[PDB]
Design a protein around this ligand. Structure first.
Ligand SMILES: *[C@@H]1O[C@H](CO)[C@@H](O)[C@H](O)[C@H]1NC(C)=O
Ligand SMILES: *[C@@H]1O[C@H](CO)[C@@H](O)[C@H](O)[C@H]1NC(C)=O
Ligand SMILES: *[C@@H]1O[C@H](CO)[C@@H](O)[C@H](O)[C@H]1NC(C)=O
Ligand SMILES: *[C@@H]1O[C@H](CO)[C@@H](O)[C@H](O)[C@H]1NC(C)=O
Ligand SMILES: *[C@@H]1O[C@H](CO)[C@@H](O)[C@H](O)[C@H]1NC(C)=O
Ligand SMILES: *[C@@H]1O[C@H](CO)[C@@H](O)[C@H](O)[C@H]1NC(C)=O
Ligand SMILES: *[C@@H]1O[C@H](CO)[C@@H](O)[C@H](O)[C@H]1NC(C)=O
Ligand SMILES: *[C@@H]1O[C@H](CO)[C@@H](O)[C@H](O)[C@H]1NC(C)=O
Ligand SMILES: *[C@@H]1O[C@H](CO)[C@@H](O)[C@H](O)[C@H]1NC(C)=O
Ligand SMILES: *[C@@H]1O[C@H](CO)[C@@H](O)[C@H](O)[C@H]1NC(C)=O
Ligand SMILES: *[C@@H]1O[C@H](CO)[C@@H](O)[C@H](O)[C@H]1NC(C)=O
Length: 549
């Protein structure tokens, strides 16, 4: 009979397919269709490896502009595309990647490079041995003959990326069990009524769903759980109306914003927002009441966000906290596609971020984020804590691998650790005016450890002390190489700042750097400037920046 995909559904491996897959690299796909990679084929086999059968795993594809040519102006203008595949496993597995029959053999580089997964080449295919881990893995497979140079940094990156998201099975806390109370399971196609349903749980089983570019998933006040099953592909954006103790989004399905134009404004027919009013449609949105709420986000893959990925509405955001795990953001080619907000007390781990703006937004206290892989695009720092002076303390960001960066100029506000200017006076974040800070606020007890920047990188830090800084520690940070000196994105700095109202000088206390390396060179106080390119620390703060060797 004619060939057909064969998927796995057993205790060791789960893969899925879409019969409405559409090969398309220039226009929007049909409402009920799913853009599929025409370049990469992926199959998975549970070890031990043998002549046994390999199971097909659907490879999704995201492209800049989502097929809307008039939206390309809102991207960086690169021709890069991003493909990815997800599967669940509970045992070591071999991932077999195949390109078309006419493609020549080419070695690959897996990022993060610290994974060191066994790789073998045979039968015009690439075999990667992915070990099982309860936290799973999220990595990039980069073919040497697919690398291109991104101007003006010259960064060497895949023209057609392929991401592999291997995740653990779903337990009863992330998957609606049989007999789950008061649930609703919409049929494939246009999804209606969720904004008025009396259901508590919305279940998206395998299939394709869409809300169009002029509506989104507004969930009624009774909905406290939305589930995206592995094999479910939902075109839309989520907004909870519930003010309950917990609102949750889980499952390993996909939530895609590809039908929305950049900066789509829900209050204006979803047309591009007027005057950068900051009302672009978020992929995750909620609204607080007068009581605490926890946002649990687990397993989901978000693709093609039309604006910031997430923000909660409310006068007091101190009552919201997040619990994020095994989550990914892909195909975020548009500008201002920020990573998630990590509200007070948040625990975020095992995440993959493709972002063209603020990545790890350190705006709240008692936050812990670890095991993150980031494909930083061309705008904003990897870590952001500028824009507005704040009282923030007790933060730990650990094990963050920035596998790529492609900045272009100083105006992009480049840097691994950055704090841009005050948004109220410098909307684009860059200004020589450093007298709008707040001497009455302090960011304290911050730890950024085990950060790794692969390939060419921007500056270690570009920090505006818009409020006092105290006890900030950088422990273990490796930069493989620096971007070109000519694009002015690699020199680190920290200018002296002053209080907006009384002119009191903002203070910096105990800012330590340890285990900082550039390529094969260890950075110390002696070569901090000449090799580490740290030459912009204000003389007033120089004595507060310590190199622990
Ligand atoms: C086959 O794959 C190569 C990359 O290996 C790609 O450049 C080429 O366009 C593909 N052939 C076609 C026409 O599908
Ligand atoms: C994509 O852009 C790169 C430069 O960044 C260029 O080398 C490559 O030829 C372009 N690909 C196509 C199909 O034009
Ligand atoms: C529910 O959402 C639909 C759009 O899908 C909208 O037309 C309708 O007015 C909404 N219902 C209410 C009560 O807001
Ligand atoms: C795997 O099988 C289970 C049980 O029949 C089913 O609920 C699930 O949808 C299947 N997964 C897929 C997408 O094939
Ligand atoms: C929060 O609002 C509810 C509903 O109006 C009310 O019953 C409750 O007393 C309020 N809680 C506080 C802290 O005032
Ligand atoms: C941080 O957690 C501590 C408990 O260790 C608590 O006292 C403090 O209020 C929290 N800070 C914020 C702003 O949530
Ligand atoms: C400091 O922050 C860490 C997180 O990095 C937290 O575990 C610890 O309780 C905080 N205590 C202080 C003030 O050092
Ligand atoms: C800096 O900006 C503030 C806020 O707009 C303004 O009040 C002040 O005059 C500016 N100072 C300089 C150096 O122009
Ligand atoms: C920094 O890396 C070294 C590698 O030898 C490791 O021993 C140390 O624990 C790391 N420091 C932190 C705080 O993770
Ligand atoms: C980098 O950008 C800053 C701010 O735009 C500017 O002051 C500096 O001169 C630039 N670096 C150089 C010397 O080109
Ligand atoms: C260190 O890196 C530089 C630049 O890549 C290279 O020229 C040099 O040979 C390297 N030295 C060692 C000992 O690896």
């Amino acid at each position: 009979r004619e060939f057909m995909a064969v998927t796995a559904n057993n205790s060791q491996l789960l893969t899925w397919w879409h019969n409405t897959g559409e090969i398309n690299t220039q226009t929007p796909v049909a409402d009920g269709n799913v853009r599929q990679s025409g370049l990469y084929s992926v199959k998975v086999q549970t070890t031990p490896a043998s002549s046994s059968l390999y199971y097909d795993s659907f490879v999704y594809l995201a492209i800049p502009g989502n097929g809307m040519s008039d939206q390309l102006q809102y991207t960086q203008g690169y021709n890069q595309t991003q493909a990815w595949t997800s599967f669940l496993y509970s045992h070591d597995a071999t991932v077999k990647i195949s390109r078309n029959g006419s493609s020549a053999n080419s070695n690959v580089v897996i990022r993060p490079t610290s994974l060191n997964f066994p790789v073998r080449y045979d039968n015009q295919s690439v075999y990667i041995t992915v070990p099982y881990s309860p936290t799973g893995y999220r990595f990039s497979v980069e073919f040497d003959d697919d690398l291109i140079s991104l101007a003006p940094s010259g960064a060497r990156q895949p023209e057609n990326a392929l991401l592999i998201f291997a995740s653990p099975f779903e337990n009863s806390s992330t998957k609606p069990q049989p007999g789950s109370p008061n649930s609703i399971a919409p049929a494939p196609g246009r999804v209606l009524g969720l904004n008025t349903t009396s259901a508590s749980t919305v279940v998206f089983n395998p299939g394709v769903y869409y809300f169009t570019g002029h509506d989104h998933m507004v969930l009624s006040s009774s909905v406290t759980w939305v589930y995206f099953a592995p094999g479910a592909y939902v075109k839309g954006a989520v907004e909870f109306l519930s003010t309950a103790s917990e609102v949750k989004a889980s499952g390993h399905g996909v939530l895609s914003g590809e039908q929305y134009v950049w900066y789509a404004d829900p209050d204006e027919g979803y047309q591009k927002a007027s005057g950068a009013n900051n009302n672009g449609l978020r992929m995750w949105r909620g609204t607080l009441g007068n009581s605490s709420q926890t946002f649990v986000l687990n397993g989901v893959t978000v693709s093609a966000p039309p604006f910031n990925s997430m923000d909660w509405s409310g006068n007091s955001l101190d009552l919201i906290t997040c619990r994020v795990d095994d989550y990914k953001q892909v195909g975020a080619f548009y500008g201002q596609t920020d990573g998630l907000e990590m509200y007070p007390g948040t625990i975020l781990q095992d995440v993959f971020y493709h972002t063209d703006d603020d990545g790890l937004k350190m705006y709240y206290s008692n936050v812990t984020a670890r095991n993150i892989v980031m494909w930083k695009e061309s705008v904003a720092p990897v870590v952001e804590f500028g824009w507005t002076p704040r009282n923030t303390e007790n933060v730990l960001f650990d094990n963050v691998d920035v596998i790529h960066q492609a900045y272009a100029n100083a105006g992009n506000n480049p840097g691994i650790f950055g704090a841009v200017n005050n948004y109220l006076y410098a909307p684009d974040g860059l200004s020589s005016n450093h007298s709008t800070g707040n001497s009455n606020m302090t960011v304290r007890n911050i730890t950024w450890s085990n950060f790794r920047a692969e390939g060419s990188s921007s500056a270690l830090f570009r920090i505006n002390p818009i409020q006092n800084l105290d006890n900030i520690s950088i422990k273990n940070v490796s930069i493989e190489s620096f971007e070109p000196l000519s694009i002015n994105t690699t020199e680190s700095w920290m200018p002296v700042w002053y209080d907006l109202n009384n002119g009191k000088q903002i203070t910096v206390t105990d800012f330590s750097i340890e285990g900082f390396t550039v390529g094969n060179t260890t950075i110390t106080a002696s070569n901090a400037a000449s090799v580490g390119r740290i030459d912009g620390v204000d003389p007033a703060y120089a004595g507060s920046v310590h190199y622990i060797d």
